[PDB]
Structures are given as structure tokens and as C-alpha cells.
Write a protein that binds this ligand. Structure first.
Ligand SMILES: N#Cc1ccccc1-c1cc(-c2cc(Cl)cc(Cl)c2)c(=O)n(-c2cccnc2)c1
Ligand SMILES: N#Cc1ccccc1-c1cc(-c2cc(Cl)cc(Cl)c2)c(=O)n(-c2cccnc2)c1
Lengths: 303, 303
């Protein structure tokens, strides 16, 4: 029993982290096979309106210093794919895991391995917000740190860190260099859009709570999907879809509580608050656990 | 910016996890050099009053099946140190990190690598509670999972998981087999004692909040250590010591807020609640971040 914000074991990713230096800028890169991936803004000198095509044409391989621990890797090629720089190196990473690159949907969670100067610092879990920012923990030097999920022994990379926005939340790309959200790797007035709460995740966490013995929020009522969504939109929650209801199926079956029954609990909680009580140690409704996350942690999958 | 419950990178520990099987019982072991450590209750058949001296005398080396991935390790010796079994194996772990064994004080935090059948599942952070339990996330099969801190590249192991108590919290030992708290590895009526909140940690997290721009709880007042402790004891908080005040020094200096000034804020928060506001994303006062944890994450140390 118990329920914690749990990240994936990070070792397979630690073995891929390197330091990329271009000029006076240093950040992190991801070394898989004979290629190092990193944010293309490593080539900028500080930026208002950079032309990265021009900036990269003016670089050579010798301008890129890649260090894996203390061993310097020799850069033998360099190209640009969207907002990611790919540096071909002359030796393949002997620690390359089985991996793939995936672009996730908002509401999905992943583990972040925060890194500085190519050295892992810490691991934590977060979600892709509906407004395509993440609420991470990132200091200067963290650019190029990656987010990932692990299935079997395959690492699915889904995030590379590029920027902190003015509100202190974070923006980045998939491993093909495409930003999540409307953001651009430049200094402009861009800001995080209005966010919403991830309804299906909140319901997943309520199921997690029941599995762990928190039942005080349950009630005898059921609601209709349409009438629940009426309340969801009023409290700035994402609409619940039949896809979401179907995804909550296995948890609904383990606990014997129908999805629309649990929706009636969430409506009550939104309308009345918790009256000084807590759920799984929280005084607010938690929305960064997916249904998969709840089953994984409350049933026990390993990697 | 940002502030997350951050665990240490787990890879150095993943390389040490193995499966120990004795009879029909399977759990996890920790393989360092040519020794595998695991909870001694792996030799029990289910237990009301086990005599582990008798139970171990009746075992041989061949009763212990140790698997590191798929490679079976040959057990060449077996002994008992307090509540931990030590199985000498015929090959040293090639992935042994620089390590040491430490026994921590209540209020200290560590990362847990939850494991099943020798395979890492997930990593999370927790604190040793004042009542010497931890609020972990542990399913059947998790015994022998370890907790640790990492400094430089040295892993300090401080917890091995032995038991879930009736309230769903967890009990275990240091890596020398000594339980934290009064617990015993037997089936009895033992229960978690009354817990308290870790005051110095709460203050550390309030400093973390200021560093991250949450200032609404600050005020012009200061309190005396004695008058603060008067309020602490009323709300079931641990007494604040001059050692604690001194430990909060560097954070007090970075923010320019005196410890006893911050204590006045905490008194106000205990007496009045938050009035619907949050701090670092929480609606309750968080107490599982040490002062070291705050400096590490708000300043940037790596390993
Ligand atoms: N690492 C690194 C680094 C190294 C040298 C120089 C600058 C950086 C950098 C650059 C950006 C940035 C910001 C914008 Cl608005 C647009 C663009 Cl293109 C890049 C940034 O956000 N951070 C950062 C800081 C804190 C948390 N998270 C990310 C650090
Ligand atoms: N693994 C494992 C395992 C394998 C085979 C048989 C039993 C176990 C076991 C044994 C104990 C236990 C409990 C008490 Cl009260 C006293 C003693 Cl000596 C041991 C236990 O608590 N768990 C457990 C369960 C859930 C979360 N965390 C810990 C699992």
C-alpha cells in the first residue's frame, strides 16, 4: 500500500547523458548510438531574432566539444532537425538502451532526469500540461535534460528541455526537435496559455485513493457524462470523453465503482471542497497521475 | 525555478539489485562486492514466533537461489547480522559503486528504489518519520528494496524494506540489519507510534517557496525560539533547536529572512490556515524536504 509520485528508474538514461559545449555555452546532450542530440540554441551568443540556418553554416565540427564523463568524443558531423542539433560522433555509445522517440499528448506523464554539465542531478515525475508546458524543476544549465517513459526495457524519450518561461514553467520539444505548444526557441513575449486540470487523471487518482483505503469522498449518486461535463467546464476541468471513461475501465472494475459513480464524487468535491480532509496525503485534487500510472503502482509492474 | 519532490538518479543502485529465493519465498537482495544482503525473513515459512537462529542452522547454501538478471549466482556462504541475511557469492558484482552504509536520524530524507523479483520498478523520495516508519509505496514482493542518498559518486545506503504495518506505513532496517524504531521481524500486535511533523523541514520548504517567488505568507513579525516552540507543541510539531536554526543558516542568508522571522510565518500558518491559498503547489505544510534538499535543488548539485 501507499501512493507516491513515482519516477521510472533512471539508469538507462544516465548512461546517455553528455556535456555539449559551443563557445561559452554549455548544456546537456543525449548520446544514442553515434549521435548526440541537444537543443540547437547551444549555437547562439545571446538571440532576439536568431537565424539558425545562418548560425549553423558558420560552425564547424571543431566548434562542438562533447564530453562523456572525462572522455572527449570527436564530432564528425553536425546537422539540424527542427529545433534539435544532431552531432555525429566517431564512437557509438556502448550504453545505448533499446529506445524510441515518441511525441506525447497533453495529460500524459513522464520522468525527467535533470542534468547539469552532462551529470545527472535528480529524477522526478511530471505531466505534459494541457497548455503544453511542464511544471518542472530546472536551473541554469539544465537545457538538454530529457523526459522519458520505460516499457519492458525500452526507453521512450518524449521531452528535451529548452526554455523556462516567465511564469517559471518549462517548454521543450520532442526528440525530433518539434516544440510542444506554440513556443519558439527565441527571446520574445511568448507566454503560457491558460491551463486546465486533467480530469481523467484526477479520476484515476481518486481510484488510487479507494484502492488505498480513502473512501470518505464516495457517495451513492451517479451522474451523466453530459451533466458531469457541465460541472467540469465550470471549474476549468477538461471535458471527459467516452475514450477517458473506457480508459478508466480496469480501475472501475478492480474497485467495483463505475466511472460515472466516481464522477459524482468529483462533482461533490469540486462544489464543496474537502472540508479539511485529505486524500492520499493531499489537500487538493491531484492530476499528474495517469490511469496507467495508477495501475502500474497499485499492481506492480517492473522494467 | 520550480520545486519537485526529487529523487537521486537510481542507476548506481539498479546495478546492485538481485532476486533472492528461499523455498517458496522470493524477495530482493542488494549485491555489493561478493555479498548479497536481504531481509532475514526470507527463510521463514509463515512466523508468529520465529527463532531465526534455529531457522538458519537448518539451511544450507543450496537453499538460496540468487539471480542477477538471468545469471544465477552461486552462494558459497551464509550468515546473519541482526535482521539482515548476508549471502556470500562466488563472483563480485562488477557494477559495485563506491558506497557506504549509514544509519540516519528521523527527519532525514532518502530515495527508495522499489523493486520486485530483483527488477527495479520505480524511484521516489521519502523521509524517516519521527516515529521511525516511512510512508512508502510498496506491494507484495518489495521486501529488500533499499533507500539511499548519493554524495559525489558515493552511494550511502540507509534503509532496507522489511514490513508493511497495519496502517499501511512501512518499517525496515539499516543495512546492518538494525530496525528503525521498536519494530521486530515477526507477526505481533506492533503498531506505529504517534507521529509528529518535522519542523525544520517545514521551515526549509518555506524558504524553498520564497526562493521560488511564493511570499504571501511572510510578515513583519519575529518570534522567540521559546514562544515558537510553545506553538509547535500545540500543533504536534517537533521542537525547534538551535542546531536546527543553525542548519537553516545558509537559506536564511540567501533569502535575507531570519529563521525566527520565518518561524513567525509558520506560527501564523498553523493558527490561521492558508485561507484557500497554496505554497509550491501544496495546500498543506510539506515536511519531507530537508534544508540540504532545498539547497541542492534550488542551487544545483549533481553526482
Ligand atoms: N542550460 C542552459 C543555458 C546555457 C547557456 C546560456 C543559456 C542557457 C539557457 C537558455 C534558455 C533560453 C531561454 C529562452 Cl526564453 C529562449 C531560449 Cl532559445 C533559451 C533557458 O530557458 N535556460 C533555462 C534556465 C533555467 C531553467 N531552464 C532553462 C538556460
Ligand atoms: N516481499 C515479500 C514477501 C515474500 C514472501 C512472503 C512474504 C513477503 C512479505 C512479508 C512481510 C512481513 C510482514 C510482517 Cl508483519 C512481518 C514480517 Cl517478518 C514480514 C511484508 O510486510 N511484506 C510486504 C507487503 C507489502 C508491502 N510491504 C511489505 C511482504
Amino acid at each position: 500500500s501507499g501512493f507516491r509520485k513515482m519516477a521510472f528508474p533512471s539508469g538507462k538514461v544516465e548512461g546517455c547523458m553528455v556535456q555539449v559545449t559551443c563557445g561559452t555555452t554549455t548544456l546537456n546532450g543525449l548520446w544514442l548510438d553515434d549521435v548526440v542530440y541537444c537543443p540547437r540554441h547551444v549555437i547562439c551568443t545571446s538571440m532576439l531574432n536568431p537565424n539558425y540556418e545562418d548560425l549553423l553554416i558558420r560552425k564547424s565540427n571543431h566548434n562542438f566539444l562533447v564530453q562523456a564523463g572525462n572522455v572527449q568524443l570527436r564530432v564528425i558531423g553536425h546537422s539540424m532537425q527542427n529545433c534539435v542539433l544532431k552531432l555525429k560522433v566517431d564512437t557509438a555509445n556502448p550504453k545505448t538502451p533499446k529506445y524510441k522517440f515518441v511525441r506525447i499528448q497533453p495529460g500524459q506523464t513522464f520522468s525527467v532526469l535533470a542534468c547539469y554539465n552532462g551529470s545527472p542531478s535528480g529524477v522526478y515525475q511530471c505531466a505534459m500540461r494541457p497548455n503544453f508546458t511542464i511544471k518542472g524543476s530546472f536551473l541554469n544549465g539544465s537545457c538538454g535534460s530529457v523526459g522519458f517513459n520505460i516499457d519492458y526495457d525500452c526507453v521512450s524519450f518524449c521531452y528535451m528541455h529548452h526554455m523556462e518561461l516567465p511564469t517559471g514553467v518549462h517548454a521543450g520539444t520532442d526528440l525530433e526537435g518539434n516544440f510542444y505548444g506554440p513556443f519558439v526557441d527565441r527571446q520574445t513575449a511568448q507566454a503560457a496559455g491558460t491551463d486546465t486540470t486533467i480530469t481523467v487523471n484526477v479520476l484515476a487518482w481518486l481510484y488510487a485513493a479507494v484502492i488505498n483505503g480513502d473512501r470518505w469522498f464516495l457517495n451513492r449518486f451517479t451522474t451523466t457524462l453530459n451533466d458531469f461535463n457541465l460541472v467540469a467546464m465550470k471549474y476549468n476541468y477538461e471535458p471527459l470523453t467516452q475514450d477517458h471513461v473506457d480508459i478508466l475501465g480496469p480501475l472501475s472494475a478492480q474497485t467495483g465503482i463505475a466511472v460515472l459513480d466516481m464522477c459524482a464524487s468529483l462533482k461533490e468535491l469540486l462544489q464543496n471542497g474537502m472540508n479539511g480532509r485529505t486524500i492520499l496525503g493531499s489537500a487538493l485534487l491531484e492530476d499528474e497521475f495517469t490511469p496507467f500510472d495508477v495501475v502500474r503502482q497499485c499492481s506492480g509492474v517492473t522494467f
